[PDB]
């Protein structure tokens, strides 16, 4: 789903998240300012997400179930895959840098994409919305 353009319109706890990865207090204070844009497309078994932030736009195309890798605006690099869990889209990502594992979930509240991530027992939330 989420076939169109969107941009983090809401988010919170990003400090506990960015603080769990052990990132300096600099990227943490500048991180909470999550305001990137993301163009997502879906094709049955072929997805295509194109991130875009004034700091480093990214892109990741692939099918659901096949492990792959995707870097996070925080300049992170992880690999895993998204799968449907009950009524949500899970996202198992493993930091290829330190394999600090990452457990997230994706939801589409009507016209908003709620992407929550977990870290060693933490939880960050990032909600998108039609531009």
Swiss-Prot record:
Keywords: Acetylation, Cytoplasm, Lipid-binding, Transport. One of its GO terms (cellular component) is microvillus. Expressed in the small intestine and at much lower levels in the large intestine. Highest expression levels in the jejunum. The keyword Nucleotidyltransferase does not apply. It is found in: Cytoplasm. InterPro entries: Calycin (IPR012674), FABP2 (IPR031272), Fatty_acid-bd (IPR000463), ILBP (IPR031259), Lipocln_cytosolic_FA-bd_dom (IPR000566). The modification N-acetylalanine is found at residue 1. Changing residue 63 to G: Localized reduction in stability. One of its GO terms (molecular function) is long-chain fatty acid transmembrane transporter activity. CDD domains: FABP2 (cd19445). Hexadecanoate binds at residues 82, 106. Changing residue 38 to G: Reduced stability. Induction: By EGF. One of its GO terms (biological process) is fatty acid metabolic process. Tetradecanoate binds at residues 82, 106. It comes from the Eukaryota. Changing residue 66 to G: Localized reduction in stability. The keyword Transport applies. Forms a beta-barrel structure that accommodates the hydrophobic ligand in its interior. Belongs to the calycin superfamily. Fatty-acid binding protein (FABP) family. This is Fatty acid-binding protein, intestinal. It comes from Homo sapiens (Human). The lineage of its organism: Eukaryota, Metazoa, Chordata, Craniata, Vertebrata. The gene is FABP2.
